[PDB]
């Protein structure tokens, strides 16, 4: 992705559910930090062409395993933290487009190994509000705020 003006690079982020009220829940590549799949929007791409590059590349996933439920409608921006920024032009956050879909294949589709450098280890399913007090504290405002807006499209789905 190109870093913008203002130096946030635009990327994209994915809630993946399922019937039970649960999300997809991945490790970040040889660490003990947990996040959702998030990707970058390169020179020409639309979000959503964005995001099934992301679900192929490091979910191992086609458009056709699932649905997309909903989408954020503006931006969502977080900052990174100073010690974090790496030195131009010079990246200090990223705005984000983040979307809801729903995994109909079987959990078996998922491969999360197939990078030479991949995103994550793997995945669990966790409970739907598990990710706000997980995720590290620079992007819980904005995982607040995409889990409140998708909230109850994933509860209907869970009854
Ligand atoms: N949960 C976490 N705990 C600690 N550090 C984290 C973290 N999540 C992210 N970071 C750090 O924040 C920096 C920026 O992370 P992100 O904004 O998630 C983009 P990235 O993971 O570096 O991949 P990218 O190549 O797509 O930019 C990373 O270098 C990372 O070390």
Redesign the pocket.
């Known amino acids: 992705?190109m870093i913008d003006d203002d130096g946030y690079?635009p990327?994209v982020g994915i809630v993946i559910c399922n019937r039970q009220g649960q999300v997809m829940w991945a490790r970040?590549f040889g660490?003990h930090?947990?996040?959702f799949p998030?990707?970058?929007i390169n020179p020409g791409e639309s979000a959503e062409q964005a995001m099934y590059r992301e679900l192929f590349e490091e979910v191992g996933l086609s458009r056709k395993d699932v649905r997309i439920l909903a989408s954020t409608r503006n931006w969502l921006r977080?900052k990174?933290?100073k010690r974090?920024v790496?030195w131009k032009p010079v990246?200090i956050?990223?705005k984000q487009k983040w979307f809801l879909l729903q995994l109909v294949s079987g959990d078996a589709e998922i491969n999360m190994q197939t990078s030479s450098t991949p995103?994550f280890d793997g995945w669990r399913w966790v409970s739907y509000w598990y990710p706000v007090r997980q995720?590290?504290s620079?992007?819980r405002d904005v995982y607040r705020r995409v889990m409140k807006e998708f909230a109850s499209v994933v509860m209907s789905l869970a009854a």
Do not use: A, I, T
């Open positions: 992705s690079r990327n970040r660490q930090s947990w996040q998030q990707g970058g977080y990174l933290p974090l790496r990246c956050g990223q995103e995720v590290v620079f992007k």
